[PDB]
Design a protein around this ligand. Structure first.
Ligand code: CDL
Ligand code: CDL
Ligand code: CDL
Ligand code: CDL
Ligand code: HEA
Ligand code: HEA
Ligand code: 3PE
Ligand code: 7PH
Ligand code: TRD
Ligand code: TRD
Ligand code: CA
Ligand code: CU
Ligand code: MG
Lengths: 143, 73, 56, 184, 66, 551, 139
C-alpha cells in the first residue's frame, strides 16, 4: 500500500523518498502566497489564542456535515476554527470548536465567508483564504 | 511583543518601538557622513565612513521594506 | 538534560531528562511555569554526583 | 565488552604529540650533522652528576603513577590521591632539577642565542619541560575533581588517561636523555 | 591597448552572466502551476493548520456558497 | 486520512533562537553548519585577495598595487584559502554527515568538537589581523621559506601574527582529527562493520590520521621559527643548515596536508555518483585500498616540491611520487564504472561531480609532468605550477564542495536549493575557471615565474594575462548566484517532507528525517551492506543486488 | 575491533619500510650522508601508527565481538545506555579566547599578555574539566 520507495520503519515512522529533481510538497500555489497564508494563519491564531485551520477539497453531498468530521483531524479540536472551501462545489463552510463559542466568532463567521467569497469571484483562491483568515482572526478575543 | 517572541514579556521591559531604531539608524549614517568634514587630508578614512553609512542605510531600508510588505513583524 | 544517551531496541537515540516537577501519564513531564528564578541545567548541581567520602 | 572512548581518544592524541617532538628531534640532528667535530662545542660541558639523578626521579615517577592506576581501578580514591601526590612532587622535582641545570649552563656561556647547540638543546628540553609542567597541571586538576564527587568509573577513567600522558612524557625524556647526554 | 583591456575585464563577465542567466532562469521550475477556478480540483485534499497555540463538541458554525 | 500541516515551513526561528546556541552548541550538525558559513566567509575574503592580484597582473606596471602589497596578497590568499577554507571544511562536512553515516547520535567528544571550531575561528582571525598593522600582513608566501621568514628579512609583526595564527588553527585541526578517529572506532551503530561504512566516512578516518602526522610537525616547526624571531635562536640559520631543515619539515607537513583536503572530497563525489546513477559504487573494496595507499604514499613524497634545491635524492622521490598516480587513477576508473551502464539524470549535485572528473584530470596529468625532475627543472616556481595546483585544488575543494553542499543541503535544512540557479552557478564557475587557468599553462612555460607583482611589456605576457583576468572575474560574478541561492532557499526553498530527496541514497543519513532530530535517529534499519538506506527504501532490490554484484 | 588495528599495522609496515629504505638510501647516495630532518620524521611517523596500532591490538584481544563488529548483528543487540555526552557548554569558546590571547602576546612578544593568556587558559580549562563535577552549593 506504501508508495514507491516508501518503507515502514521499526518505530512505525514512514521513510519516503522522491525522485531527484522532484518536489515532496508540490502545492499548486505560488511559494510567496503560501508564506502570506502561513503568516495570516500563524499570527492570526496567535492574536486570537485559537488554532485556525484551512481546508481545500471535496465536501461530499452536504458541506455542513463534512466540515464537522474534518475539524476532528485539526490538533486541539475544541479550540480550533476550520475554514473549508470546495472549488468544485463552490461552497464555503466554517466550523469551530466548543471553546470558540462565546468568544465573538458568531459575528466573524459570516464576515470571513463574505470576504472570502468576494475574492473567490476574481479567480483568487489563496487571496480569498488570506482575506477570510485576517477578518476572522481580527474578530476573536484571546482565550 | 507577546509571550512566544519574548517569553519574559510580562517580567520587564521587552519592547522597543521600531521607529526609534529606524530613525536612529538614519541618524547613525548621517553622523558617519558629516564626519568627513574635518582637517584630515587623507581619503582612506572617508571611504570607510561612506561604506559603513551605506551599509547602515541599506539595513534600515531592507528592514523598513520587509516590515511594510508584511514579511516580518 | 542528563547528557546520557540511550539507544532504544528499535534504534531510537534518546537523551535521559530529569523532570523538575510532576510527570504526566507517561515519561514526559508536565511543563512548569517560569517564576523569575534561575533554573538548574547541570545534573551535578542537583546532587547526582554524590560525595567523594568523609576523610582527609 | 566496551572500548574505553576516553582512553582511545587520549592514546590517539598522544601518538600525534610524538610528531611534535619529531620536529624538535630533526632540528637537533640537523645541527649535529653540521657540527664539524665539536658536539657539544665549547664552552658547553654537560654533566651526568645532575642529569642522571633527575632522570631517575622522572623514571621513578612512572612507577608511582602506575601504582595510582591500580588504586583507581580498585575504587580506592584515597589510594589514588596518595600515589598521585607523590608523583606530582617528584614530577615537580624534575622541573626544579632541569631549571637548576639551566642556570649553570647559562652562567657558563650556553644560551639560546649564544650557540647553535644552545638553541637545539634548550628548545628540545624546554618544550619537554613545558610538557612536564602541563602534566603537573593535569595532576592538580584531576586531584581537585576527586574531592568534588564520588569515585565513579568515569572518574577512574580520567585517572588512567592522565597516567598515559605521564608515561608518554617519561618515555620521551628517556629518548632525549640518551640522545643528548650519551649520543654526542 | 588600455581601453580594450578594461572593457573585456568588465564587459565579458557581465555579458556572459546575462546570456547564461537567460538560458536557465527562463526555464520552468519544478513548482506546479497555480490552480485556477475554472479548472477542476484534481489535487489531493489539503488540510492546513497553524502550530499556535502550542499544545469533540462543536459549538456551531456558518455556511456559504459562491 | 487527513493530516494537519502548515502551508509553508517556518522561515526562521523566533528572536533568540540561535545566538545562545552558537556559543554553547555541542551538536555536530549545528557546528558543521557554522563551519560552512565561516569557511565561505573566508572563501569570499580570500577570493577578493586574488582579484586584486589578478586585476594588477592584467596590464604591465604597478597601476594601483605596490610590490609589498602584492607580496602580502598571495601569502594571505594562499594561507586563507588552503588553511582557513579548505582544511576546516574537511571537518565541516565531517561534523555534518559522519555521525549520521555510522548511525551515531553524536561525536565522541562533543565539547572538544566545539572547541575546535572556536579555536580555528580565532586562530584564522589572528593571521588575517596582520593587514591592519602598518607594516602589513605576511609577504613571504604560504611556504614561508627560510631565512626569508627570519627576523632580519621579515621584521614586521604581520609575519609573527601569521605564525601564531597557524599554531592556534593547527591545534583545532589536531583535536578535530582526534575526535573523528575516536568517533569512527567507538560510535558505530550495531551491524555497521568497518567494511560497511560509506566511502566518505572511510576517507575522513584516513584523513584524520594524516592530520596527526602533518599538523604537529608544522606546529613544532613554527614554534622553532618563532624562537628565531624572538629569542634570536639559530634553528634555521643558513650556516647551521636550517635552510634545508625548514623546507624538509614544512613539506613533510604540506604534501600530507593537500591530501587532507583531497581524500574527503574524493569521498564526497563517491557518495553522489551511486545516488544519481541508480547503481552501487564500483570497486567499493578497491576504493578503500586506494585511499589507504594514497595516505601511505603521501608521507614519503614530500621532497618533490624541492627538485630545484639540488639537495634531495631525486630517484627516490620521483619514483615514489609516480606510485601515487596509480591509486588515484583507480579512483577515476571506479567513478567512471559507477556511471557506466547506469541511469544518469544530471542534477546539480551530479553536475558538479561530473565537472570534478573533467577538471581534476587535467591537473592530475600536470602532476605527473612535474613529478619528473627533468621536466620540473624548467617549470618549477613558474605559472605552470599555479595552473597545475588550481586545477587539482579547484577540482576538489570547490567542485566537490559545491556537489556536497547541493547534495546535503536538503538533509540539514528541510529545503531544496534552486536547480535552475544551481545550473547557472555551475556553468559560470566552470567557464570562468577554465578561461582563467587554461592560459596559465602557456604563461609558465613561456618563462613567467610565480609570485611576480610586475612584468615588462616586452616580456610578451600581456595577452595571456588579460585573458586570465577576464576569466577570474567570471569566477567572481559566479559567486552571486550561489550566495543568492543559499540566502533564498534557506528560508523560501522547496520543503523536503521525505527522508531521501534524491530517492536512491545509500548512506544512513538518508534513512532519517530532513532535518534529522537532535540525536539524528528515531529508528535504525538492519545493516547488511554499504547501502542500508537503499535496502530499506527498496526491499525488492535486495535479491537483485546480491545476485548481480559480480560481473 | 580487529579491522581497526589492522589498518594501523598496514600503515606501520609501510612507514617502517620507507624509513629504513630511505635512511639507507641517503647514507650512501644523498650528498652529505643521512638526511636527518627528513629521516627523523619518517622514523617517528611509524611510532604514531605503532602506538595507536599496539593499543588497538591489546584492546581487541580483551573485548569480545561488539555489535558493530558483528557481520550479521541486530539493531536491538545494541540497546542500552551509551554513555555521557555533554548537552551544552560555553567553556570551549572561552578556552579558544584564552589560547588566542596568549598567541597574540607571543606574536607581539608581550610578556604581560603571555602570562595573562596562560592564566586564562588554565582558568578556562579548569571550568571545562570541572563543569560536570561541581557539587551543589553548601551555603
Ligand atoms: C545608536 C543608534 C544606531 C542605530 C543603527 C541601527 C541600524 C539597524 C536598523 C535595523 O535593521 O532595524 C532592525 C533591527 C531589528 O529588527 P526586528 O524587527 O527585530 O527583526 C529583524 C529580523 O532579523 C528580520 O529578519 P532579516 O531578514 O532582516 O535577517 C535575516 C538574516 C540576515 O540576512 C541578511 O541580512 C542578508 C540580506 C542581504 C540582502 C540581499 C537582498 C535581499 C532582498 C530581499 C530578499 C529577502 C526577502 O538574519 C538571520 O536571522 C540569520 C542568522 C544567521 C545569519 C549569519 C549568516 C552570515 C552570512 C555570511 C556571508 C557569507 O533593529 C535593531 O535591533 C537595531 C540594532 C541597533 C539599535 C540601536 C539602539 C536602539 C535604540 C537605543 C535607544 C537609545 C538611543 C536614544
Ligand atoms: C570576541 C569574540 C567573542 C564573541 C563573544 C564571546 C562569548 C563568550 C562568552 C561566554 C559566556 C556565556 C555565558 O555564560 O552566558 C550564559 C549565561 C547564563 O547561563 P545559563 O545557561 O542561564 O545558566 C544559568 C543556570 O540556570 C544555572 O545553572 P549553571 O550552574 O549552569 O549556571 C552557573 C554557571 C554559569 O553562570 C553564569 O552565568 C556565569 C557566566 C559568566 C561568564 C562571563 C564571561 C567571561 O556557572 C558559573 O556561575 C561559572 C562562572 C565562572 C566564571 C569564570 C570565568 C573565567 C573565564 C576565564 C577566561 C576568560 C576569557 C578571556 C579572553 C578574553 C579576550 C581577550 O548568561 C550570561 O551570564 C551572559 C554572559 C554574557 C557576557 C559576556 C560579555 C563579554 C563579551 C566579549 C568577551 C571577550
Ligand atoms: C566575526 C565576529 C563576530 C562579531 C559579533 C557577532 C554578532 C552576532 C549576531 C547574531 O546574533 O547573529 C545571529 C542573528 C540572529 O540571532 P537570534 O535572534 O538568536 O536568531 C534569530 C533567527 O530567527 C534565528 O533563526 P534560525 O536559528 O532558524 O536561523 C537559521 C539560519 C539562518 O540562515 C539564513 O537564512 C541566513 C542566510 C545564510 C547566509 C548565506 C551564506 C552562504 C554560505 C553557504 C553555506 C552553506 C551551508 O541560521 C543558521 O543556522 C546559521 C548558522 C551559522 C552561523 C555561523 C556563525 C558563526 C560566528 C560566531 C560569532 C558569534 O542574526 C541576525 O539576524 C543578524 C543579521 C546580520 C548578519 C550579518 C553579519 C555579517 C558577519 C559575517 C558572518 C561570517 C562569519 C565570519
Ligand atoms: C594540548 C591538548 C590536550 C587535550 C587533548 C585531549 C585528548 C583526549 C580526548 C578527551 O578525552 O577530551 C577530554 C575533554 C573533551 O571534552 P568532552 O567533549 O566533554 O569529552 C567528554 C569525556 O568523555 C569526559 O572525560 P573526562 O571529563 O574524565 O576528562 C578526560 C581528561 C581529564 O582531564 C584532566 O583531568 C586534566 C586535563 C587538563 C588539561 C591540562 C591543562 C593544559 C594547560 C597547560 C598549562 C602548562 C603550559 O583526560 C584527557 O583529556 C587527557 C589529557 C591529559 C593531559 C595532557 C595535557 C597536555 C598539555 C601539554 C602542555 C604543552 O577535554 C578535556 O577534558 C581536556 C581538554 C583540554 C582542552 C584545552 C586545549 C588547549 C590547551 C592549550 C595549551 C597551551 C598552553 C599555553
Ligand atoms: C583552495 C585553494 C585555492 C582556491 C579556491 C583559490 C582561488 C583562486 N586563486 Fe589562488 N592560490 C592558492 C589556492 C587557492 N586559490 C595557493 C595555495 C596559492 C599560492 C600562494 C602562494 O603563492 O604563496 C594561490 C595563489 C594564486 C595565484 C598565483 C600567485 C602568484 O601570482 O604568484 C593566482 C593567480 O592569479 C591565484 C588566483 C586565484 C583565482 C583567480 C581564484 C578564484 O578561485 C577566486 C575567485 C573567487 C572569488 C570568491 C572572487 C571573490 C568574489 C567576491 C564577490 C568578493 C567579494 C567578497 C567580499 C565582499 C567579502 N591564486
Ligand atoms: C588537492 C590538492 C593536490 C593534489 C590532489 C595534488 C596531486 C599531485 N601533485 Fe601536487 N601540488 C599541490 C596540490 C595537489 N597536488 C599544491 C597546492 C602545490 C604547490 C603548492 C605550493 O608550492 O605553493 C602542488 C605542487 C606539486 C609539485 C611540486 C612542483 C613544484 O613545486 O615545482 C609536484 C611535484 O611532483 C606535484 C605533483 C603531484 C602529483 C604527481 C599528483 C598526483 O596525486 C595526481 C595524480 C592524478 C592522476 C595521475 C590522475 C588520475 C590518473 C589517471 C587517470 C591514469 C593516468 C595515468 C598516467 C598518466 C600514467 N604537485
Ligand atoms: C618563553 C621563553 C623565555 C625566554 C627564554 C630566553 O630568551 O632566555 C635566553 C637567555 C639568553 O640571553 P643572553 O643574551 O645569552 O644573556 C644571558 C646572560 N646570562 O638565557 C637563556 O638562554 C635561558 C634559556 C632557558 C631555556 C628556555 C626554554 C624555553 C623553551 C620554550 C621557548
Ligand atoms: C596548587 C596545589 C599544590 C599542592 C601540591 C599537591 C597537589 C594536590 C592538590 C590538591 C588540590 C585540592 C583542591 C580541591 O580539590 O578543591 C576543589 C576546588 O578547587 C579547585 O578547583 C582548585 C583548582 C586549582 C587550579 C590551579 C592549578 C595550578 C597548577 C599549578 C601546577 C604547577 C574542590 O572544591 P569543592 O570540594 O567542590 O569545594
Ligand atoms: C571555457 C574554456 C576557455 C578557454 C580559453 C582559452 C583561450 C586561449 C586564447 C589564446 C590566444 C593566443 C593569442
Ligand atoms: C596539461 C597541459 C595543459 C595545456 C594547456 C594549454 C592551453 C592553450 C594555450 C594557448 C596559448 C597560445 C599562445
Ligand atoms: Ca599592473
Ligand atoms: Cu606535492
Ligand atoms: Mg620552490
Amino acid at each position: 500500500d506504501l508508495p514507491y520507495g516508501s518503507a515502514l520503519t521499526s518505530s512505525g515512522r514512514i521513510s519516503a523518498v522522491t525522485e531527484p529533481g522532484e518536489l515532496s510538497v508540490h502545492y499548486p500555489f505560488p511559494t510567496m502566497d503560501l508564506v502570506v497564508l502561513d503568516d495570516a494563519l500563524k499570527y492570526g491564531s496567535r492574536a486570537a489564542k485559537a488554532r485556525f485551520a484551512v481546508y481545500i477539497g471535496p465536501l461530499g453531498a452536504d458541506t455542513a456535515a463534512t466540515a464537522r468530521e474534518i475539524l476532528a483531524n485539526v490538533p486541539t479540536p475544541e479550540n480550533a476554527v476550520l475554514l473549508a472551501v470546495s472549488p468544485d462545489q463552490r461552497a464555503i463552510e466554517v466550523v469551530y470548536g466548543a471553546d470558540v463559542k462565546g468568544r465573538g466568532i458568531e459575528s466573524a463567521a459570516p464576515l470571513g465567508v463574505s470576504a472570502a467569497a468576494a475574492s473567490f469571484k476574481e479567480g483568487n483562491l489563496i487571496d480569498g483564504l488570506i482575506s477570510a483568515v485576517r477578518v476572522m482572526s481580527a474578530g476573536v478575543s484571546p482565550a | 511583543v507577546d509571550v512566544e517572541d519574548v517569553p519574559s514579556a510580562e517580567w520587564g521591559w521587552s519592547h522597543m518601538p521600531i521607529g526609534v531604531m529606524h530613525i536612529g539608524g538614519l541618524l547613525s549614517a548621517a553622523f558617519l557622513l558629516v564626519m568627513m568634514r574635518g582637517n584630515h587630508v587623507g581619503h582612506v578614512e572617508d571611504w570607510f565612513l561612506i561604506g559603513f553609512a551605506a551599509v547602515i542605510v541599506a539595513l534600515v531600508g531592507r528592514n523598513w521594506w520587509l516590515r511594510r510588505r508584511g514579511w516580518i513583524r | 538534560e542528563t547528557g546520557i544517551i540511550k539507544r532504544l531496541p528499535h534504534g531510537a537515540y534518546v537523551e535521559l531528562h530529569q523532570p523538575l516537577g510532576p510527570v504526566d501519564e507517561h515519561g514526559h513531564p508536565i511543563p512548569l511555569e517560569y517564576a523569575g528564578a534561575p533554573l538548574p541545567k547541570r545534573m551535578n548541581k542537583l546532587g547526582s554526583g554524590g560525595a567523594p567520602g568523609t576523610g582527609s | 565488552n566496551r572500548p574505553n572512548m576516553v582512553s582511545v581518544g587520549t592514546i590517539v592524541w598522544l601518538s600525534s604529540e610524538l610528531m611534535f617532538f619529531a620536529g624538535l628531534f630533526a632540528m637537533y640532528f640537523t645541527a649535529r650533522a653540521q657540527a664539524g667535530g665539536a658536539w657539544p662545542p665549547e664552552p658547553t660541558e654537560l654533566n651526568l652528576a645532575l642529569a642522571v639523578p633527575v632522570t631517575l626521579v622522572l623514571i621513578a615517577s612512572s612507577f608511582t603513577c602506575q601504582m595510582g592506576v591500580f588504586a583507581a581501578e580498585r575504587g580506592d580514591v584515597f589510594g589514588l590521591r596518595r600515589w598521585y601526590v607523590i608523583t606530582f612532587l617528584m614530577g615537580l622535582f624534575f622541573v626544579l632539577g632541569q631549571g637548576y641545570e639551566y642556570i649553570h649552563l647559562v652562567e657558563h656561556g650556553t644560551t639560546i642565542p649564544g650557540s647553535a647547540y644552545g638553541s637545539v638543546f634548550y628548545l628540545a628540553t624546554g618544550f619537554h619541560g613545558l610538557h612536564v609542567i602541563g602534566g603537573l597541571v593535569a595532576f592538580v586538576l584531576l586531584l581537585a575533581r576527586t574531592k568534588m564527587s564520588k569515585f565513579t568509573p568515569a572518574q577512574a577513567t580520567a585517572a588512567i588517561v592522565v597516567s598515559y600522558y605521564w608515561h608518554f612524557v617519561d618515555i620521551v625524556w628517556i629518548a632525549l636523555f640518551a640522545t643528548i647526554y650519551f649520543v654526542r | 591597448s588600455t581601453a580594450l583591456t578594461h572593457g573585456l575585464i568588465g564587459g565579458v563577465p557581465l555579458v556572459l552572466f546575462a546570456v547564461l542567466a537567460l538560458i536557465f532562469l527562463t526555464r520552468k521550475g519544478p513548482h506546479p502551476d497555480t490552480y485556477k477556478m475554472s479548472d477542476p480540483w484534481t489535487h489531493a485534499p489539503i488540510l492546513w493548520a497553524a502550530e499556535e497555540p502550542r499544545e469533540v463538541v462543536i459549538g456551531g458554525g456558518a455556511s456559504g456558497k459562491w | 486520512e487527513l493530516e494537519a500541516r502548515r502551508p509553508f515551513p517556518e522561515r526562521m526561528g523566533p528572536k533568540g533562537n540561535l545566538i545562545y546556541k552558537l556559543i554553547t552548541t555541542t551538536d555536530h550538525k549545528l557546528i558543521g553548519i557554522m563551519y560552512c558559513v565561516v569557511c565561505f566567509a573566508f572563501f569570499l575574503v580570500g577570493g577578493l585577495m586574488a582579484l586584486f592580484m589578478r586585476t594588477e597582473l592584467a596590464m604591465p606596471g604597478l597601476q594601483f598595487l605596490s610590490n609589498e602589497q602584492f607580496n602580502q596578497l598571495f601569502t594571505m590568499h594562499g594561507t586563507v584559502m588552503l588553511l582557513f577554507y579548505a582544511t576546516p571544511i574537511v571537518f565541516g562536512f565531517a561534523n555534518l554527515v559522519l555521525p549520521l553515516q555510522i548511525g551515531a547520535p553524536d561525536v565522541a567528544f562533543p565539547r572538544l568538537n566545539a572547541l575546535s571550531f572556536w579555536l580555528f575561528l580565532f586562530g584564522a582571525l589572528i593571521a588575517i589581523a596582520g593587514f591592519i598593522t602598518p607594516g602589513g600582513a605576511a609577504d613571504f608566501g604560504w611556504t614561508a621559506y627560510s631565512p626569508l621568514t627570519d627576523a632580519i628579512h621579515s621584521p614586521g609583526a604581520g609575519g609573527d601574527l601569521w605564525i601564531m595564527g597557524l599554531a592556534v588553527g593547527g591545534l583545532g585541526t589536531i583535536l578535530g582529527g582526534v575526535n573523528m578517529i575516536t568517533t569512527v572506532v567507538c560510535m558505530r551503530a550495531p551491524g555497521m562493520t568497518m567494511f560497511r561504512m560509506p566511502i566518505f566516512t572511510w576517507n575522513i578516518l584516513v584523513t584524520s590520521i594524516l592530520v596527526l602526522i602533518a599538523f604537529p610537525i608544522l606546529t613544532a616547526a613554527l614554534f622553532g621559527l618563532a624562537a628565531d624571531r624572538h629569542l634570536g635562536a639559530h634553528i634555521y640559520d643558513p650556516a647551521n643548515g636550517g635552510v634545508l631543515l625548514w623546507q624538509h619539515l614544512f613539506w613533510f607537513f604540506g604534501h600530507p596536508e593537500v591530501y587532507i583536503i583531497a581524500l574527503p572530497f574524493f569521498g564526497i563525489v563517491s557518495e553522489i555518483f551511486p545516488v544519481f546513477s541508480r547503481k552501487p559504487i564500483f570497486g567499493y573494496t578497491t576504493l578503500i585500498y586506494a585511499t589507504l595507499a594514497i595516505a601511505a604514499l603521501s608521507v614519503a613524497v614530500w621532497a618533490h616540491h624541492m627538485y630545484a634545491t639540488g639537495a634531495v635524492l631525486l630517484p627516490f622521490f620521483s619514483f615514489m611520487t609516480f606510485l601515487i598516480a596509480v591509486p588515484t587513477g583507480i579512483k577515476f576508473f571506479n567513478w567512471i564504472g559507477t556511471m557506466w551502464k547506469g541511469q544518469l539524470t544530471f542534477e546539480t549535485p551530479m553536475l558538479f561531480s561530473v565537472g570534478f572528473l573533467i577538471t581534476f584530470l587535467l591537473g592530475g596529468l600536470s602532476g605527473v609532468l612535474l613529478a619528473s625532475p627533468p621536466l620540473d627543472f624548467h617549470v618549477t616556481d613558474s605559472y605552470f605550477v599555479i595552473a597545475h595546483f588550481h586545477y587539482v585544488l579547484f577540482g576538489t575543494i570547490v567542485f566537490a564542495t559545491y556537489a556536497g553542499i547541493y547534495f546535503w543541503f536538503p538533509k540539514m535544512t528541510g529545503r531544496l536549493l534552486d536547480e535552475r540557479l544551481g545550473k547557472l552557478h555551475f556553468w559560470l564557475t566552470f567557464i570562468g575557471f577554465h578561461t582563467t587557468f587554461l592560459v596559465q599553462h602557456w604563461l609558465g612555460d613561456e618563462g613567467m615565474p610565480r609570485r611576480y607583482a610586475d612584468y615588462l611589456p616586452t616580456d610578451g605576457f600581456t595577452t595571456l594575462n588579460v585573458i586570465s583576468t577576464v576569466g577570474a572575474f567570471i569566477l567572481g560574478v559566479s559567486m552571486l548566484p550561489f550566495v543568492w541561492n543559499v540566502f533564498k532557499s534557506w528560508r523560501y526553498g522547496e520543503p523536503v517532507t521525505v527522508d531521501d530527496p534524491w530517492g536512491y541514497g545509500n548512506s544512513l543519513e538518508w534513512a532519517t528525517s530532513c532535518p534529522p532530530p537532535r540525536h539524528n535517529f528515531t529508528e535504525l534499519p538492519r545493516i547488511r551492506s554499504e547501502r542500508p538506506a537503499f535496502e530499506l527504501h527498496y526491499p525488492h532490490m535486495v535479491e537483485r543486488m546480491r545476485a548481480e554484484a559480480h560481473v | 575491533m580487529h579491522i581497526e588495528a589492522r589498518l594501523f599495522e598496514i600503515l606501520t609496515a609501510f612507514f617502517a619500510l620507507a624509513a629504513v629504505v630511505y635512511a639507507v638510501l641517503t647514507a650512501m647516495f644523498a650528498t652529505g650522508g643521512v638526511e636527518w630532518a627528513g629521516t627523523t620524521a619518517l622514523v617517528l611517523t611509524t611510532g604514531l601508527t605503532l602506538i595507536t596500532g599496539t593499543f588497538f591490538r591489546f584492546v581487541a584481544r580483551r573485548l569480545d565481538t561488539r555489535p558493530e563488529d558483528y557481520e550479521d548483528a541486530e539493531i536491538s543487540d545494541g540497546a542500552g545506555e551509551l554513555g555521557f555526552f555533554a548537552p551544552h557548554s560555553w567553556w570551549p569558546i572561552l578556552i579558544s579566547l584564552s589560547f588566542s590571547t596568549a598567541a597574540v602576546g607571543a606574536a607581539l612578544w608581550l610578556p604581560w599578555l603571555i602570562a595573562a593568556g596562560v592564566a586564562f587558559v588554565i582558568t578556562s580549562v579548569c571550568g571545562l574539566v570541572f563543569e560536570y563535577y561541581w557539587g551543589p552549593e553548601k551555603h
